[PDB]
């Protein structure tokens, strides 16, 4: 018995059998059921049960070391297998699990125990962050509460008829009346019910309408509010994840006002920019310490003939770049006899190159079997679709270009870490689409009335294809809305599902990723006193200080500036005072520096370049010609010399400026990979988005409208989608759009949709060309995207080395000893005395561990009666809940009062007392002033406001975590420097809201752009501008401002400005903006927050801490 089995185990052939069966159940488990599948399910669990007996025969059960339960794997497969037979022999909803048996399969590929081991390490060490996350998201789900309750629920309703059409008025009727859903203002085939409020600069209601609260069901099936503690927490966790966050953010804003948006980027900074990289950090110093341990462990051949068929290399690839739709007949012979002739001039090169060296050491190179295969392709693809293939002649390219050529070096020489980790997310992915699709995919079936018009939305858990699309766009980022449609026909136990899938795919495997990729991828008189009037310190603040006070004139040239006389006078005499001022202060510093250093210099170029236009501007309006408005625009770019002098600032621009190199290499190698992938698009989709629609832009039946024709002779429009593969450059937005997942739902419903040219698209008739958008989104935004965060990272890294005076040359264990070094430099130890009988008696008291625990367990029971307010309850229970706070703040004052009887003037020694010292005065002035201001009632929403100081006696919660403290420690090392991005952000932004305001103050409103988010004044366009900060919505905004079609055009004669944009114009304003912000200054967060939390994480681990000292100055 025991013989059998301990030889059975350790033979290879045991273990590849089970793996064997393990793979052909899975591939069963991917299509449709059958009763063959009911018996090869007896089969499976047969195998497993005999692999259970072997193994326990061999081990037995737990009573020893190395027994069979000792092993966690044997946990997995000893559970997996118990619940088989439970849901053989006797709910559905366990009967999926035995899909997590697929798990194993890791082990298949080389190399998986790094990886393995990396993810293990990452999700044990988010243990602190775990309740740090937990406590920010209460406090900002507080809020949020306090602020938005009730607000998503506006409505503007219809007045009551005076006609006496309802009948004369009474309290019932107008009551009856208001709350008839037939009565509330909706455009038609809107699906929700539109926002407003009556506060100075909320949505407006059209005349006939008031702006009411409490009617009807907040937006997104209810699922959108703040009105209980619960729905506020998964409205921060979306904002905190920037899932969809534009439209939570659209609606608060519109309901509340927009100073509102105050709250918005508190909670994105924190959130997003600090919390979210404490994550990715864990993750990046997990898999260096597990690669760290693994490490440890241990004529035709000469030049001229190679530039020749370089250059008719990019010649093809020129030509193949240029096929797009709907050619004219001599393009095409045209491109057919290039084709001819560059096959030609290949098969030349290949024999020439045979012949003169020898065919052995010819196919002994890898570039020359390369250069075979193509040459096999293109005569196989004349003689007889082989086009696809054409393709392969790009990659030569890489011979050639010495930066294309290391990148791809670098990918050879670490793939295997990199099949690793796609290998486990791919199975991670297949693993929760089978769970999803048995717990949710009937629901879909049974309950498909709900959904708007009855009809099974495009994406749903109805078969596996459909599941793994699912699960891979929440991995992508996006979950809530999928989470919406699941429990509208399911139950509570989607949220679970989705945040899980959230959470795996996207924080842990996909910074591991990026983690990977940073691992590999890392007179003489007069020129006398010009001298000194330039370097003199008020000279250069006053200079200073009129570009700033001029700057932000520039903000007030609204669309309101011509009714306001006074201020167009204003604007004109400073344009006039700063063209003089320009021309004075260039005499002054050529005098001061001379014309060689004034024009070696950047700075002074620029300054020149700004005195150039404004004296432009100057002969143009003598001249009574308009001055131009980019040209004074222009003045704007001098406030970027005084910015890179602030405190601090330097260490920033210089990692900037060093880093820009390198981010132009990127760029490079991004767009010729995505000229891969645009040719291929047009190949597939060129001129088969158009589709047949009516007077409403909705979308025919193919029963109806079989093709074109049909569809022009029943006088219907034939027409195309906005975006499209129609050729190169359109294929280059549309995948900008997918890459960033920014109008990508779309562009892939047409593409899934698509037939011959000609066609009517039928719905999912396509479904497989899914594939195309997958490999892309992998290779252009997993990929390649995420180098510009690895390159910051690293660069960031040296110059901070460079500001702190540090070596280059010295390791990281010095560096960490002279830390240690310059921290005993400067400690000191504390003492104070027990006073007095009563005093005394008070201090024995009061200084014991109990009490400290007892004021933490009053302020969780305080935060708990917080989380219990709620919208729609009684004024009885809000007063209740008002007077137990008031019970609470008297408990915290007497805490105060007590230390301070103890500690007499010692109590002001240690921070944290003065913080709660602090508090304990604001809560006090606080209660005089909201009972003076609740008896007068000076107006809710400055109530609401007031309110936000209760929050200061919850956040004494984080005294005395050390976990936490850690963290925080780490954030307020970085503080100085994560501020001065945000100053470089902002600025930024001021510039391009500036330049906004004067291109798209006029356009009509179309996509995102309406009566409340526009470019019309300053504020608005910095609100949406922080919104596209993220790539947030850009796709509507681009719809809006590249409209040229169905517009009127400028009358100069009439004053009339036009309402249209321009498609160029759109276009370099809005890619720019994605890419200085989105892809390099938002970046720079991480980067900072990933060098502060490696050091503090260092020093805790392998050196000392501040903690340390405390303790050791605790016993002294
Ligand atoms: C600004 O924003 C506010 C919040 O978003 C919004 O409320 C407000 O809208 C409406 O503005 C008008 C002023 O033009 C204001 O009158 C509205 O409030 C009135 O509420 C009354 C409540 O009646 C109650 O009925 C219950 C029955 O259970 C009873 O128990 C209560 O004691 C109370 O009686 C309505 O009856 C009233 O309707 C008017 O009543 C007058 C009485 O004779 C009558 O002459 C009028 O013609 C009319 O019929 C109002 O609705 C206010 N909305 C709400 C919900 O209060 C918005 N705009 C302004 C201008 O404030
Ligand atoms: C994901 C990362 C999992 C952790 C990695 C792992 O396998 O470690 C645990 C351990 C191996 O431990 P070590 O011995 O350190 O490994 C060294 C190799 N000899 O493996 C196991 O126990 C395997 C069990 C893990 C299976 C993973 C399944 C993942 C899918 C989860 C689905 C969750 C569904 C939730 C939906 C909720 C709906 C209400
Ligand atoms: C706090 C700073 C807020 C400063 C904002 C200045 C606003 C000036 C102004 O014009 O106010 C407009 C307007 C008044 O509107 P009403 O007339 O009431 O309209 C009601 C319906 N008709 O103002 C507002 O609504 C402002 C509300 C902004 C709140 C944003 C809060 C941001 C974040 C708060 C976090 C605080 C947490 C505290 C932590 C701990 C403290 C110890
Ligand atoms: C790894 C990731 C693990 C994910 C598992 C954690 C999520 C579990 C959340 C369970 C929530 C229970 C749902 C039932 C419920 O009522 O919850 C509260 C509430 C609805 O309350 P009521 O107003 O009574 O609804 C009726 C009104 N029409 O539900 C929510 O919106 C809660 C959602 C919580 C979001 C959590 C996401 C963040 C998690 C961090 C990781
Ligand atoms: C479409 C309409 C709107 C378009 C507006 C675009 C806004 C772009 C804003 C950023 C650039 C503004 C112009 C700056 C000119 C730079 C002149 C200059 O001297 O540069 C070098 C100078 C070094 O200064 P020193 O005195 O040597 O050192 C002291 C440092 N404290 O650089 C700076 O400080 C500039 C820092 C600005 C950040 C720019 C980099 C970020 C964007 C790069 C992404 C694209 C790369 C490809
Ligand atoms: C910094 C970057 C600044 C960007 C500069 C852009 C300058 C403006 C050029 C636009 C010119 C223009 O109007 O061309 C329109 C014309 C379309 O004509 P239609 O009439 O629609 O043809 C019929 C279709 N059925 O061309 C286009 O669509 C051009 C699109 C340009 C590509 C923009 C995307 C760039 C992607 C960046 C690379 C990302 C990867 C790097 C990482
Ligand atoms: C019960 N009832 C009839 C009255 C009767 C007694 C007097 C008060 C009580 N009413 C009540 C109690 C608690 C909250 S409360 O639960 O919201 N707690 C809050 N704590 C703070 C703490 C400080 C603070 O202002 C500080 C700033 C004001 C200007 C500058 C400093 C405001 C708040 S409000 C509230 F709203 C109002
Ligand atoms: C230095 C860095 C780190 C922080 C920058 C400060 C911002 C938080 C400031 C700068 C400009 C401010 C904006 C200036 C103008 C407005 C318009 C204001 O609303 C109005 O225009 C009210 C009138 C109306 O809506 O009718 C709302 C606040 C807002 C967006 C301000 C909100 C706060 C902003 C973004
Ligand atoms: C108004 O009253 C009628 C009966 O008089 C009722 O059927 C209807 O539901 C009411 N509408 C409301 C309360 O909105
Ligand atoms: C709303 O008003 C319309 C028009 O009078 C009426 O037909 C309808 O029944 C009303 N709905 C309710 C719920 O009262
Ligand atoms: C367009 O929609 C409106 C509103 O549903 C409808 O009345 C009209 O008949 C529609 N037009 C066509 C051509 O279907």
Not at 937 to 949: E, Q
């Amino acid at each position: 018995i025991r013989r059998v089995a301990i030889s059975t185990m350790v033979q290879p052939i045991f273990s590849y059998f089970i793996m064997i069966t393990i793979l052909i159940h899975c591939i069963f488990m991917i299509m449709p059921a059958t009763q063959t599948t009911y018996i090869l399910e007896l089969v499976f669990l047969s195998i497993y049960t005999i692999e259970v007996v072997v193994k326990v025969l061999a081990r037995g059960f737990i009573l020893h070391p190395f027994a069979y339960l000792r092993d966690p794997w044997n946990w997995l497969d000893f559970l997996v297998t118990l619940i088989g037979y439970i849901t053989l022999v006797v709910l559905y909803a366990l009967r999926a699990f035995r899909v997590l048996r697929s798990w194993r399969t890791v082990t298949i590929v080389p190399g998986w125990r790094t990886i393995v081991d990396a993810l293990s390490l990452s999700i044990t060490s988010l243990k602190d962050l775990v309740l740090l996350l937990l406590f920010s998201l209460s406090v900002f789900a507080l809020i949020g509460l306090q602020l938005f309750m009730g607000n998503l629920k506006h409505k503007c309703v219809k007045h009551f008829p005076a006609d006496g059409s309802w009948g004369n008025f009474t309290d019932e009727r107008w009551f009856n009346y208001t709350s008839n859903s037939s009565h509330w203002y909706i455009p038609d085939d809107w699906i929700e019910y539109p926002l407003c409020g009556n506060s100075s600069g909320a949505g407006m209601c059209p005349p006939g309408y008031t702006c009411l609260q409490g009617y009807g069901g907040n937006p997104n099936y209810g699922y959108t509010s703040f009105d209980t503690f619960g729905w506020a927490f998964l409205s921060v966790f979306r904002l905190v994840t920037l899932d969809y966050w534009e439209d939570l953010y659209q609606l608060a804003l519109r309901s509340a006002g927009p100073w509102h948006i105050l709250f918005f980027i508190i909670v994105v900074f924190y959130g997003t920019f600090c919390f979210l990289n404490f994550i990715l950090a864990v993750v990046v110093m997990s898999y260096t310490h597990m690669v760290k341990r693994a490490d440890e462990e241990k004529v035709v051949l000469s030049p001229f003939f190679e530039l020749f068929i370089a250059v008719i290399i990019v010649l093809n690839i020129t030509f193949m770049a240029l096929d797009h739709h709907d050619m004219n007949i001599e393009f095409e012979r045209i491109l057919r006899t290039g084709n001819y002739i560059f096959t030609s001039i290949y098969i030349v090169e290949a024999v020439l190159k045979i012949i003169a060296l020898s065919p052995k050491f010819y196919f002994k190179d890898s570039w020359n079997v390369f250069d075979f295969i193509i040459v096999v392709f293109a005569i196989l693809e004349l003689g007889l679709v082989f086009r696809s293939f054409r393709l392969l002649r790009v990659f030569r390219l890489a011979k050639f270009w010495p930066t294309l050529n290391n990148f791809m070096s670098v990918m050879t020489k670490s793939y295997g870490a990199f099949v690793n980790v796609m290998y486990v997310m791919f199975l991670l992915l297949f693993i929760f689409a089978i769970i999803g699709m048995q717990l949710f995919g009937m629901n879909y079936i049974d309950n498909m009335e709900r959904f708007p018009d009855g009809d099974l939305p495009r994406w749903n858990f109805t078969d596996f294809l459909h599941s793994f699309m699912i699960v891979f766009r929440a991995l992508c980022g996006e979950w809530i809305e999928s989470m919406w449609d699941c429990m509208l026909v399911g139950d509570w136990s989607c949220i679970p599902f989705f945040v899980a899938v959230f959470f795996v795919g996207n924080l842990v495997i996909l910074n591991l990723l990026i983690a990977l990729l940073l691992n590999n991828y890392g007179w003489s008189n007069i020129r006398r006193v010009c001298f000194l009037l330039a370097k003199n310190k008020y000279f250069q603040k006053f200079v200073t200080a009129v570009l700033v006070i001029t700057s932000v004139l520039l903000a007030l040239e609204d669309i309101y500036l011509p009714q306001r006389p006074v201020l167009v006078n204003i604007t004109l005499y400073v344009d006039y005072v700063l063209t003089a001022f320009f021309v004075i202060e260039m005499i002054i510093m050529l005098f001061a520096v001379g014309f060689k250093k004034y024009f070696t210099s950047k700075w002074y170029w620029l300054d020149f370049i700004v005195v150039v236009a404004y004296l432009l501007n100057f002969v143009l309006m003598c001249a009574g010609i308009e001055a131009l408005q980019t040209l004074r625009l222009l003045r704007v770019f001098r406030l970027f010399r005084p910015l890179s002098k602030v405190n601090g600032m330097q260490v920033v621009t210089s990692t900037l400026v060093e880093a820009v190199p390198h981010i132009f290499n990127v760029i490079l190698v991004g767009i010729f990979f995505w000229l891969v992938f645009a040719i291929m698009g047009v190949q597939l989709f060129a001129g088969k988005f158009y589709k047949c629609v009516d007077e409403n832009s909705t979308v025919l039946s193919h029963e109806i409208t079989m093709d074109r024709n049909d569809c022009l002779h029943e006088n219907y429009t034939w027409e195309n989608s906005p975006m499209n593969f129609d050729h190169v450059g359109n294929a280059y937005l549309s995948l900008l759009q997918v890459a960033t997942f920014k109008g990508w739902l779309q562009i892939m419903n047409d593409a899934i949709d698509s037939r011959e040219v000609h066609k009517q698209p039928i719905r999912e008739t396509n479904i497989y060309m899914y594939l195309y958008f997958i490999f892309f989104i992998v290779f252009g935004s997993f990929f390649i995207l995420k180098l510009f965060v690895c390159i910051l990272i690293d660069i960031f890294r040296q110059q901070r080395r460079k500001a702190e005076g540090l070596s280059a040359t010295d390791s990281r264990t010095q560096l960490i000893y002279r830390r240690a070094v310059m921290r005993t430099m400067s400690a000191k130890p504390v003492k104070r005395i027990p006073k007095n009988k009563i005093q005394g008696c008070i201090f024995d008291l009061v200084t014991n561990q109990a009490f400290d625990i007892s004021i933490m367990v009053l302020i969780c029971l305080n935060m708990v009666t917080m989380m219990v307010e709620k919208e729609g309850q009684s004024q009885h229970m809000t007063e209740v809940l008002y007077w137990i706070n008031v019970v609470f703040i008297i408990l915290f004052t007497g805490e105060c009062v007590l230390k301070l009887i103890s500690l007499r003037h010692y109590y002001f020694t240690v921070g944290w007392n003065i913080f709660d010292f602090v508090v304990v005065i604001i809560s006090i002035v606080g209660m005089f002033l909201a009972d003076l201001i609740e008896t007068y009632f000076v107006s809710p929403t400055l109530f609401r406001v007031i309110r936000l100081a209760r929050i200061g006696r919850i956040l004494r919660l984080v005294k005395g975590a050390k976990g936490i403290r850690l963290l925080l420690l780490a954030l307020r090392k970085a503080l100085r420097t994560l501020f001065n991005v945000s100053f470089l952000l902002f600025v930024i932004m001021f510039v391009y809201a500036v330049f906004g305001m004067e291109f798209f103050m006029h356009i009509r409103d179309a996509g995102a752009i309406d009566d409340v988010y526009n470019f019309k004044t300053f504020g608005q366009s910095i609100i949406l501008l922080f919104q596209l900060a993220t790539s947030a919505g850009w796709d509507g905004v681009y719809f809006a401002i590249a409209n040229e079609e169905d517009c009127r055009a400028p009358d100069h004669e009439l004053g009339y400005p036009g309402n249209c944009g321009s498609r160029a114009l759109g276009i370099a304003y809005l890619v720019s903006y994605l890419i200085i912000t989105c892809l390099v200054v938002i970046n720079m967060y991480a980067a900072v927050i990933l060098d502060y939390v490696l050091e503090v994480y260092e020093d805790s681990k392998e050196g000392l801490t501040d903690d340390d000292y405390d303790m050791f100055f605790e016993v002294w």
